[PDB]
Amino acid sequence: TNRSTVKISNVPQTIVADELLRFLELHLGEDTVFALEIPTTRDNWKPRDFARVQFTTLEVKSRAQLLSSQSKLLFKTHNLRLSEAYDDIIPRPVDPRKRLDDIVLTVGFPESDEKRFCALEKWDGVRCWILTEKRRVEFWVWESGDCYKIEVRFEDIIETLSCCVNGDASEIDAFLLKLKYGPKVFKRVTDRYRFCKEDFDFMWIRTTDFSGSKSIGTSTCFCLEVHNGSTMLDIFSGLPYYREDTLSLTYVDGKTFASAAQIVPLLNA
Amino acid sequence: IIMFEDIFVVDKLDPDGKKFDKVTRVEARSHNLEMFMHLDVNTEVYPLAVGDKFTLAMAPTLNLDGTPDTLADKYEYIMHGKLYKISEKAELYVSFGGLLMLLQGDPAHISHFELDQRLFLLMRKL
Amino acid sequence: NLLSLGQDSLTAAYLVNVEKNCYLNRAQMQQLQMYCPFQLPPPAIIKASPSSTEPQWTGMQLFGMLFPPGFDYTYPLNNVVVSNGELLSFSEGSAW
Amino acid sequence: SSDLQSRKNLTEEISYGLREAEQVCNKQQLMVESWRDFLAVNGEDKEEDSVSDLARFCYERQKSATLSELAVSAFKDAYRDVQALAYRYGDQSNSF
Amino acid sequence: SKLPANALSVNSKEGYFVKPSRTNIYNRVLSILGEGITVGPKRFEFLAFSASQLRGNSVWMFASNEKVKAEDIREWMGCFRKIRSISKCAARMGQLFSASRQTLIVRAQDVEQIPDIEVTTDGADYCFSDGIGKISLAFAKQVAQKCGLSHVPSAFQIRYGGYKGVIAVDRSSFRKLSLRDSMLKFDSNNRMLNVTRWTESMPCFLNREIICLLSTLGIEDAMFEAMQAVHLSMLGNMLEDRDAALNVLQKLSGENSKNLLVKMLLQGYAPSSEPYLSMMLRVHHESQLSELKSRCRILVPKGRILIGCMDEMGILEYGQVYVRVTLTKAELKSRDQSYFRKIDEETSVVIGKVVVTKNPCLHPGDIRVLDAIYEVHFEEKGYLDCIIFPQKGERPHPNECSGGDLDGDQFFVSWDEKIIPSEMDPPMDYAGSRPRLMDHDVTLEEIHKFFVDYMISDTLGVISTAHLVHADRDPEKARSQKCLELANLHSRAVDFAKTGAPAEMPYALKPREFPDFLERFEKPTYISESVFGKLYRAVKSSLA
């Protein structure tokens, strides 16, 4: 029940991923299958006897398990048997509420002794995914075409704070993430048996800072500019060491502190 | 007249097919006795799905009180075969005209079976 | 051996021993017993269905009427065991 | 094939298997003394030249006899897997 | 933490063969090593890295100054252009960075050139003298005065002027110093003498590999079970009994050590009183039990850990050695034994069957049973805290001990009598890989390439774990070809620091399973039924 991917025991060797997807969508709800992958011994012409399918909602997974337990799944005179999988096909949270799309991401540090914050470089339209099982938070930032992944673990953060950007103390429009260590940086690089419902046919490799001014390497805090959420506090309460207090911030023009050298976090001579 | 009789629950099917037009080997685990069974059954004439519960009985003769070589009205899947291999948790190897059966259980549960003898197979799916 | 089964008897024996799902009734078995020199084995299949009378014979017992009672044959590769002139087991291969 | 979709899948699988076998033969053709500098674990900038020259490999194979023998051996070794697909795409009732 | 292998030079299949692709972290590390790190009005430059720092991803940096620059220090240490190997040059440049005690200065006028001895049997080059040396008595007296050493050891590790090796005492010395042939690593402009370790007569310990390789010759599980039981019994009694505290402190860490807690253990108040000492005893017991849970460490009082040397006598044959060590509390309490000879009040000779073992051992042939003998001629030379190896023989003793050398390395000795010496196995071959020699001098770039590439394909730590898992799973361990392959891969990996040869760990040999006595809680855990599993269950029952 920890994951959503279910491993099918036996499937016919003559079928393709599209046929199995159509069968699953016919028996289950419409477009309730996210990822379907059939492993192949050869490159593209010898699929294996089993396959792994990822569902969108855990209710669909439970219904599929119930159908398989009653032997009600018959696809080309083959009784499909469903079993738990080891790892997810795509690291995507099951809860749609945790998925945040088109939000504003900025970096900085507590520059002033008072309740002030400085913004170095601001990114717009980033994607934020909160993975409770993996105990990590993913940030997808698109910069000059190729996207980059910023990975922050639960041990990376030390204290979670909520702030506001509109200027209203009652509303919560920002979140502070004090980082003790540095976040991991990845980079995206560049079909018959893999549906995946999207363009996830790539790999992630670890890279250095992609910012021109290298704001990530000299910032020990992260700020998430998000719209006011009634239940957003419950989602943000899962982070370790969360403070249930209201704090306000102001923006300080700190663009002058930008180093183009390899050693970023040092002071200027 | 019945030597071994226990309720069995199927675990998995070897072909896992509904209309394969082939003999299907089933794997059923005994209840309250911890005995594993292999048996070749014809699904087309005798349907058996996963999770079903069926009883099993073995008798040397179908007659009442002797006459070796009227229990037909009770069961519905009577078979006839012989035991050719007894060496193993002892296990039995009985072939019903080419349909192999492997009854693996405990040494104390199976002790009154002789080598190269004729025995029947009484089955009923409740 | 110099003489083999042939191109047709080999295929027929393969079909008899591989299917294992087609049961011959009493009439067909007795009709085929006219050619076999040995006697008729027990049916080994009393009830194949709750509402099926006329107990039938399996296919592998039909091929068992071709061996003398004293002949014993063992083929570990194809898992073929012949005891007392009766074919007990067979899996695949058709090599014997 | 059971239906038309199975036939199309089998055709695509056969095409991909033949392409993979041709690639294996092209890779095996490089096991000569002329490509000892390329087969070594070093830095060679002619990696794309050995791949883009697809129409020259057949011409070089048809001229040499040892290269032809290596190519046919590799093709048989890679085509055994292709021939193995008949048991996957073939039914049990197939007479052949 | 350590940089994973996937963060540097990830593999990708491009073309007919697979070719690794360098990541941006690789280029970042190269640029940092090349340009250097600038902190304020300084710029640090790459000097060298020691053998220990290479295994810990560490490197020394020195800020260039107007007086002395990095190149000045590099050329002052020595001339390294004679070495044509990338790994060998780095090793020789970084070997002169160990902690040492300063002593007097000796000029280059009085040094000998004693010829060595070599034997070639079965087409294999077996050299007895790898790092052995010779020292006089006056030199020992002069070198032991600045370190506050009362007793004069018969052997002590020394390195000076690029030379490295252990030297032994002799009563027929000509002058203060002597030198052999197979000791010159590189030419240096200085000959400063310094000493790291003289002698440590610490009690022996039984690591995991010793029990793993000794569980096939005929040693049962009852012996180790009883030894663990008596060890835990004497550990639990150490709290409320002050008599056991001194006996344990005098037989666990330091045969002759003076400390505030050691003095008060023999004569003190009740354990309930003196909280400063009682809580120290409690935390020491907790540390001991935690160490036992982490790894197997059996305290055996009838064995020591000492270095070995050779004497210019040539009387001992192949299979005859001399064992001599100090007397502990247990030895002094009852010195009447069949295999123990009381030659002196403080030093007692051994006549039992003594085996030689190191820390890394993965081959069943390392167990070589040696019969110790007592000779008046050997005792006249006055050898102490050093086992004697014969000069002549088919193969040298360090060669059979995983192909080692006489470079002051420690050796496990034990005058035990309940071991099984019936089974004997030949050792593995000690022939390493072919050296890689370049056609040009080092331009300070390929050394950086080697340093960065050392992180990639560094499978030194996983080979031992895989070998232990495979030995615990498959019975008749250290007999199958899998164990031999693991031992060969371990030897090749331990040779990586000397020669640039990757270990090339296969994917199919990964364990994918770990026993209970490990800290890998995230990885799957399987209940082991080996001797280690029984020992861990006994420890768990004793602690609970």
Side-chain angles (χ1 to χ4, degrees), chain A residues 1-108 110 115-132 134 136-165 167 169-170 172 174-190 192-210 212 215-224 226-230 232-243 245-269, chain B residues 2-10 12-13 15-20 22-30 32-33 35-60 62-64 66 68 71-86 90-105 107-108 110-111 113 115 117-126, chain C residues 1-50 52-53 55-91 93-96, chain D residues 1-36 38-43 48 50-51 54-55 57-68 70-90 92 94-96, chain E residues 1-8 10-13 15-112 114-138 140-144 146-180 182-198 200-240 244-245 254 268 270-319 321 323 330 352-370 372-375 382-385 387-394 396-419 421-429 431-518 521 524-544:
Chain A
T1 60
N2 304 121
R3 287 177 161 88
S4 178
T5 60
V6 183
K7 174 182 176 300
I8 310 180
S9 300
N10 55 330
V11 292
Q13 306 287 350
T14 67
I15 69 178
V16 210
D18 204 332
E19 308 177 16
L20 186 59
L21 174 62
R22 288 183 174 270
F23 176 82
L24 292 182
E25 292 182 357
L26 187 145
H27 274 256
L28 298 180
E30 185 70 21
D31 294 359
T32 53
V33 172
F34 186 81
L36 196 154
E37 175 181 350
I38 300 181
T40 59
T41 61
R42 291 299 179 270
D43 47 357
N44 204 20
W45 64 283
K46 203 168 185 178
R48 299 187 62 91
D49 189 70
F50 64 95
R52 307 184 302 107
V53 51
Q54 179 180 3
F55 298 100
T56 302
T57 310
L58 296 181
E59 176 180 349
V60 183
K61 173 185 177 181
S62 60
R63 181 170 55 184
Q65 287 286 350
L66 180 60
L67 291 181
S68 180
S69 59
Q70 299 179 355
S71 68
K72 296 184 60 180
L73 295 179
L74 187 62
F75 176 68
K76 298 185 181 301
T77 184
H78 274 266
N79 293 119
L80 305 180
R81 307 303 181 183
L82 294 183
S83 180
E84 294 291 338
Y86 297 95
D87 191 7
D88 285 347
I89 304 179
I90 296 180
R92 169 172 163 267
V94 58
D95 197 328
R97 292 156 43 86
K98 300 179 181 180
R99 309 155 188 166
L100 302 182
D101 294 357
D102 190 70
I103 60 177
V104 177
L105 171 59
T106 177
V107 299
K115 305 169 61 181
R116 307 184 63 179
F117 197 85
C118 59
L120 280 69
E121 181 166 330
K122 179 175 298 181
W123 297 278
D124 50 353
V126 303
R127 180 186 302 180
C128 177
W129 285 0
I130 300 180
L131 286 74
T132 304
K134 293 300 182 61
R136 59 187 178 184
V137 184
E138 298 183 0
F139 297 95
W140 290 28
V141 181
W142 284 264
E143 188 73 16
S144 300
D146 294 359
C147 61
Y148 305 93
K149 174 188 297 179
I150 301 180
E151 180 181 1
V152 179
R153 308 187 311 174
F154 285 172
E155 283 69 22
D156 196 309
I157 70 179
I158 55 180
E159 181 253 24
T160 302
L161 272 176
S162 59
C163 300
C164 59
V165 73
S170 60
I172 301 300
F175 287 94
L176 290 183
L177 290 81
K178 298 298 182 60
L179 300 189
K180 174 172 52 58
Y181 294 160
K184 298 181 180 61
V185 182
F186 292 85
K187 184 177 182 179
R188 179 182 60 89
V189 299
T190 300
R192 185 161 58 95
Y193 297 92
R194 297 180 57 182
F195 174 65
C196 302
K197 204 180 180 180
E198 264 173 351
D199 50 331
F200 271 81
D201 49 356
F202 57 86
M203 284 295 184
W204 294 101
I205 60 173
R206 299 200 60 179
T207 179
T208 179
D209 198 332
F210 57 92
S215 300
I216 304 181
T218 177
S219 300
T220 180
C221 179
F222 270 65
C223 180
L224 301 181
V226 78
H227 312 286
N228 298 329
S230 302
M232 194 63 60
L233 300 180
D234 298 359
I235 300 301
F236 273 88
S237 180
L239 303 181
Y241 299 153
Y242 172 78
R243 182 191 297 181
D245 295 330
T246 301
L247 190 142
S248 60
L249 286 180
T250 177
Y251 273 87
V252 183
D253 179 70
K255 192 175 297 181
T256 59
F257 283 171
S259 180
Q262 299 172 351
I263 302 301
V264 192
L266 283 187
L267 279 73
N268 195 336
Chain B
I2 301 179
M3 299 180 175
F4 170 78
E5 183 173 14
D6 192 6
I7 312 298
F8 277 69
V9 182
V10 292
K12 64 178 61 180
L13 311 182
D16 285 322
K18 185 60 179 300
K19 206 64 178 61
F20 275 169
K22 192 191 302 179
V23 57
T24 64
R25 176 176 296 182
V26 300
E27 302 184 7
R29 295 190 176 275
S30 179
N32 81 88
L33 281 184
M35 302 182 60
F36 190 83
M37 185 193 67
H38 275 287
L39 182 58
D40 299 0
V41 70
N42 189 13
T43 310
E44 294 184 349
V45 300
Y46 195 85
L48 285 178
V50 58
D52 293 359
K53 303 180 179 59
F54 67 98
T55 183
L56 185 140
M58 300 180 182
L62 297 179
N63 298 26
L64 298 179
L71 281 310
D73 58 330
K74 301 180 182 179
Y75 298 88
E76 59 191 18
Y77 199 69
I78 317 176
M79 278 186 170
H80 192 192
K82 62 173 298 181
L83 172 65
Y84 62 94
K85 181 164 56 181
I86 203 180
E91 56 182 353
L92 300 182
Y93 290 81
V94 179
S95 61
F96 308 97
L99 299 181
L100 302 180
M101 188 196 67
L102 190 152
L103 181 62
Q104 181 179 181
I110 300 179
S111 299
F113 287 83
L115 186 59
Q117 68 173 8
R118 293 298 190 273
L119 51 88
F120 291 88
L121 182 62
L122 288 312
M123 295 178 58
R124 191 202 310 108
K125 51 184 302 179
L126 300 180
Chain C
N1 59 324
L2 180 60
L3 296 174
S4 179
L5 290 178
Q7 67 176 25
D8 192 13
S9 299
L10 175 57
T11 302
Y14 181 87
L15 285 178
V16 166
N17 298 330
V18 162
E19 292 181 353
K20 303 178 181 178
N21 61 89
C22 304
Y23 302 94
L24 302 181
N25 57 328
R26 175 170 167 266
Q28 294 174 356
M29 185 55 60
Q30 290 186 357
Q31 177 68 20
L32 295 179
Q33 200 270 350
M34 295 293 298
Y35 300 91
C36 298
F38 299 97
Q39 292 296 333
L40 204 60
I45 299 293
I46 304 301
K47 282 190 174 183
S49 298
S52 63
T53 60
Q56 303 163 327
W57 278 255
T58 177
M60 295 179 60
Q61 278 179 333
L62 176 65
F63 195 79
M65 296 185 300
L66 305 172
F67 308 101
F71 175 75
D72 295 354
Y73 180 81
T74 53
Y75 199 74
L77 185 61
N78 294 333
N79 194 20
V80 176
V81 178
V82 181
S83 180
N84 199 20
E86 289 187 348
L87 181 57
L88 297 181
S89 60
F90 168 78
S91 59
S94 70
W96 62 292
Chain D
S1 297
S2 300
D3 53 353
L4 175 134
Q5 189 69 208
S6 300
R7 187 61 181 181
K8 287 185 173 179
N9 298 333
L10 181 60
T11 301
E12 291 287 69
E13 188 164 349
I14 290 302
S15 179
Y16 275 100
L18 292 181
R19 190 177 306 177
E20 191 270 351
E22 186 270 349
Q23 188 70 207
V24 168
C25 295
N26 292 17
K27 177 181 180 299
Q28 190 70 209
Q29 285 191 20
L30 297 179
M31 303 300 179
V32 293
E33 296 183 357
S34 180
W35 295 98
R36 293 186 299 181
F38 177 78
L39 267 59
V41 184
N42 49 15
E48 297 81 3
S50 301
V51 183
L54 188 63
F57 281 161
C58 67
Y59 177 80
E60 296 179 10
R61 181 204 300 109
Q62 293 178 354
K63 291 298 299 300
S64 300
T66 60
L67 275 66
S68 300
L70 296 179
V72 300
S73 180
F75 199 92
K76 293 183 178 181
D77 294 359
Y79 197 75
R80 290 190 297 101
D81 299 329
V82 181
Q83 295 179 353
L85 305 180
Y87 302 93
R88 294 185 178 183
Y89 281 77
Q92 292 77 9
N94 194 285
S95 59
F96 288 156
Chain E
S1 60
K2 195 63 61 182
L3 292 178
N6 57 85
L8 295 174
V10 62
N11 292 329
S12 61
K13 186 175 183 178
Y16 299 96
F17 308 96
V18 57
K19 187 187 67 61
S21 60
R22 313 298 178 178
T23 60
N24 290 331
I25 312 301
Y26 192 93
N27 298 20
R28 168 181 172 86
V29 174
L30 286 186
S31 300
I32 291 301
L33 292 181
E35 305 294 334
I37 302 179
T38 67
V39 178
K42 284 187 177 182
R43 193 168 77 96
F44 298 88
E45 312 301 325
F46 159 78
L47 270 190
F49 49 90
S50 179
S52 300
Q53 290 191 344
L54 183 58
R55 311 181 187 274
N57 301 20
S58 300
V59 65
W60 280 95
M61 286 193 178
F62 184 84
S64 298
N65 200 330
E66 308 297 330
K67 292 87 178 181
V68 179
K69 299 184 302 179
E71 301 84 312
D72 305 330
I73 301 179
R74 198 177 309 167
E75 68 185 11
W76 170 86
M77 295 185 60
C79 180
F80 302 98
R81 275 196 168 188
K82 300 182 180 301
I83 303 300
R84 291 303 185 93
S85 180
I86 307 303
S87 60
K88 293 297 183 179
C89 178
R92 303 314 172 187
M93 188 175 59
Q95 67 177 8
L96 197 61
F97 286 92
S98 300
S100 302
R101 299 301 179 91
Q102 299 299 123
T103 53
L104 293 178
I105 308 179
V106 175
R107 285 171 278 96
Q109 189 177 356
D110 45 331
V111 280
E112 295 187 352
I114 304 179
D116 296 359
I117 50 178
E118 297 80 12
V119 53
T120 302
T121 173
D122 300 329
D125 300 329
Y126 294 159
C127 185
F128 275 81
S129 59
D130 298 329
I132 198 59
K134 186 181 183 304
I135 201 60
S136 60
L137 294 84
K141 299 301 180 301
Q142 286 291 337
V143 77
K146 289 181 173 56
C147 298
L149 189 57
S150 60
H151 61 81
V152 275
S154 300
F156 54 95
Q157 176 176 323
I158 192 181
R159 49 173 56 92
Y160 62 98
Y163 305 94
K164 181 177 57 181
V166 66
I167 56 187
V169 303
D170 197 322
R171 305 305 173 92
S172 60
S173 300
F174 305 97
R175 50 185 174 184
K176 196 178 190 62
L177 291 180
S178 61
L179 237 176
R180 287 191 173 273
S182 300
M183 201 179 300
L184 177 60
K185 303 303 181 179
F186 70 100
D187 54 330
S188 62
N189 300 327
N190 50 8
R191 290 153 295 272
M192 173 67 65
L193 293 175
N194 47 47
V195 182
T196 65
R197 176 216 308 169
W198 43 90
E200 290 174 334
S201 300
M202 307 303 178
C204 72
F205 309 101
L206 298 183
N207 300 270
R208 291 185 173 182
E209 75 286 346
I210 303 179
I211 299 184
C212 178
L213 299 181
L214 283 182
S215 299
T216 59
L217 290 82
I219 298 182
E220 307 182 21
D221 197 16
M223 165 185 173
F224 294 152
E225 184 70 23
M227 188 155 51
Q228 181 62 234
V230 69
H231 173 50
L232 62 87
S233 300
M234 71 180 62
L235 179 62
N237 190 265
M238 194 191 314
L239 286 175
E240 57 178 346
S272 60
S273 180
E274 307 189 42
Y276 174 79
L277 189 140
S278 68
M279 302 199 78
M280 275 188 170
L281 292 185
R282 291 179 63 259
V283 72
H284 284 75
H285 288 191
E286 290 190 2
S287 179
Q288 286 290 342
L289 65 86
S290 300
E291 195 275 342
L292 291 180
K293 184 179 302 179
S294 62
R295 56 183 178 181
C296 181
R297 186 177 186 177
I298 300 299
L299 286 75
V300 185
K302 60 188 63 179
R304 305 298 179 87
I305 299 179
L306 291 170
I307 60 180
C309 292
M310 298 183 297
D311 297 332
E312 300 83 0
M313 304 305 300
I315 301 181
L316 302 180
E317 60 182 4
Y318 177 79
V321 295
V323 179
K353 318 293 288 183
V354 182
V355 299
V356 181
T357 311
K358 292 171 179 172
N359 303 331
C361 298
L362 295 87
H363 195 261
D366 192 14
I367 300 303
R368 315 296 289 185
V369 186
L370 298 176
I373 61 179
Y374 170 78
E375 297 291 341
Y383 65 100
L384 295 86
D385 303 330
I387 54 184
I388 305 302
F389 301 143
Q391 290 184 297
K392 288 298 299 178
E394 297 183 356
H397 285 41
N399 198 322
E400 295 184 354
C401 200
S402 68
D405 54 351
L406 296 87
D407 199 4
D409 49 352
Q410 301 179 0
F411 297 97
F412 158 78
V413 297
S414 179
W415 42 85
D416 202 342
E417 74 289 339
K418 50 191 171 181
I419 61 179
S422 60
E423 184 63 33
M424 188 64 59
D425 303 326
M428 62 179 181
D429 190 9
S433 60
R434 293 173 52 90
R436 286 83 180 274
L437 284 74
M438 307 298 296
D439 280 318
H440 54 269
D441 300 72
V442 181
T443 177
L444 208 60
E445 310 299 82
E446 43 272 14
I447 177 177
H448 284 332
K449 291 285 187 174
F450 165 77
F451 174 78
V452 180
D453 293 1
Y454 191 83
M455 309 178 183
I456 299 96
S457 69
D458 195 337
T459 62
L460 181 60
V462 299
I463 289 180
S464 59
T465 303
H467 181 267
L468 263 60
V469 171
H470 285 293
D472 290 359
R473 290 296 174 269
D474 200 314
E476 293 186 355
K477 47 189 176 300
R479 291 304 179 180
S480 62
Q481 64 278 40
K482 178 178 300 180
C483 299
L484 305 179
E485 294 177 3
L486 260 310
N488 202 332
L489 291 180
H490 186 271
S491 60
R492 192 174 184 179
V494 83
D495 195 68
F496 195 18
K498 300 167 58 181
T499 61
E504 305 177 8
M505 179 66 181
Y507 298 153
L509 269 301
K510 298 182 180 301
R512 303 192 301 102
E513 191 65 47
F514 299 87
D516 205 323
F517 43 88
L518 285 180
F521 297 97
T525 302
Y526 186 82
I527 303 301
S528 60
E529 289 75 16
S530 60
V531 290
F532 289 90
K534 297 293 299 180
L535 189 145
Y536 196 72
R537 283 180 284 268
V539 171
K540 194 74 61 180
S541 60
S542 61
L543 294 179

